[PDB]
């Protein structure tokens, strides 16, 4: 059964979150919830851990599971705005950052407001793309930044069968580890596509060259 006390598990989870062992921090915070269901601070920390590790849907679900009891809870509002931001809904991140800023004038809420404001202004602005009614290598090269060599080193690890067969941990065979990594790369590249779209990328050079 559950063996130690709730603030001990919370301090444990905060220490593991600081040290960077995000899976063990998430497990400790889950044990803390098993001790006491519905602690808003523990849901916020568990959402922060999944936000860091890359499981955005449960990071969101923990954010609403922190916020339904007190819709004025500032840390939960900040966490939900962060997770919606990194998921891609910059509009909903912006409105939740505004709610948090109005509830309490904090630097992190303000910072998130300029984050979502820049994200929306980069894609839209005012003239923008002209639109049509209607209905890879270089693209990921400029989306991923200087991480492209890490990317193709990961697929060079994909393209070896002895690297597919592995025995890391109980079942965490290194094929799955490589999948978790490359999936984080794919989600981060998709996020960079929503953050600065490719049409904004040549809009940079078009506000350039002609100038």
């Amino acid at each position: 059964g559950l063996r130690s006390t709730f603030p001990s598990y919370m301090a444990e989870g905060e220490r593991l979150y600081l040290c960077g062992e995000f899976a063990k921090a998430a497990h400790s915070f889950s044990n803390a919830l098993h001790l006491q269901n519905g602690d808003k601070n523990c849901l916020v920390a568990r959402s922060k851990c999944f936000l860091k590790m890359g499981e955005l849907e449960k990071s969101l679900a923990d954010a609403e599971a922190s916020l339904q009891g007190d819709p004025t809870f500032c840390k939960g509002i900040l966490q939900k705005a962060e997770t919606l931001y990194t998921m891609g809904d910059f509009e909903f991140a912006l409105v939740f950052y505004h709610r948090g800023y109005k509830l309490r004038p904090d630097r992190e809420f303000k910072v998130g407001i300029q984050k979502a404001q820049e994200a929306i202004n980069n894609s839209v602005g005012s003239p923008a793309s002209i639109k049509l009614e209607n209905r890879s290598e270089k693209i990921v090269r400029q989306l991923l930044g200087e991480l492209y060599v890490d990317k193709e080193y990961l697929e060079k690890l994909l393209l070896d069968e002895d690297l597919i067969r592995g025995t890391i941990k109980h079942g965490l065979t290194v094929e799955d580890l490589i999948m978790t990594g490359i999936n984080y790369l794919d989600t981060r590249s998709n996020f960079w596509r929503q953050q600065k779209p490719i049409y904004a990328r040549e809009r940079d050079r078009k506000l350039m060259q002609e100038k």
């Binding site: 060599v149 890490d150 080193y153 070896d160 002895d162 690297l163």
Partner: protein, 51 residues
């Protein structure tokens, strides 16, 4: 202070990138040695199979 903190995060990313490249070199050495091991293993399995 904003410019100091920005230079921080840039330098942290740069040390991170270069030590990541060192990790790639170490991984490539281990992969090539264990690929040679694979070649010897596949050979020896072929003669044991035929025998």
């Amino acid at each position: 202070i904003l410019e100091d903190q920005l230079d921080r995060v840039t330098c942290r990313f740069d040390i991170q990138l270069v030590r990541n490249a060192t990790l790639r070199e170490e991984l490539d050495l281990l992969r090539i040695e264990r690929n040679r091991y694979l070649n010897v293993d596949h050979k020896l399995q072929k003669e044991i199979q035929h025998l």
